[PDB]
């Protein structure tokens, strides 16, 4: 590579770095809560259906 | 699904849970009492009709 091409590369690397980038976040607490809540809704419906099947 | 749609779902699940829901209740005692009472009325009438049939 010519020295000019390396100079251009040295410039552009410095500009394509110094972007923002997202953090990874452990969102499993929020997702676990929604899983527990959705499951609780399912248990209530499953119970209601069971009261008809059981006739009691 | 996009992360936005999952975020919206995580919100709405938490709100459609945390309703009230009725308990099932064993009301068979109250219903059994009414059955016994209605049957007792029927036995009295059946007896009265029988006193005419029997002529005694």
The whole-angstrom distance between B26's CA and the closest CA on chain A is 7
Solved by what technique?
cryo-EM
Which residues lie closer than 8 Å to A9 by C-beta, 6 or more apart? A1
Tokens 């419906």 correspond to A45
Q: How far is CA B20 from CA A42, B14, B15, B28, B31, in A?
A: 14, 13, 11, 24, 26
Interchain proximity A51–B24, CB inside 8 Å: yes
Contact B24 A33 (CB under 8 A): no
Cα separations in angstroms, A27 against A36, B6, B16, B27: 15, 11, 21, 45
List the resolution, Å. 2.6
């Amino acid at each position: 590579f010519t020295l000019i091409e390396l100079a251009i590369v040295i410039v552009i690397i410095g500009i394509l770095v110094a972007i923002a980038v997202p953090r990874f976040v452990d969102l499993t607490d929020q997702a676990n809560q929604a899983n527990v809540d959705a499951t609780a809704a399912a248990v209530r419906s499953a119970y209601a259906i069971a009261t008809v099947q059981a006739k009691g």
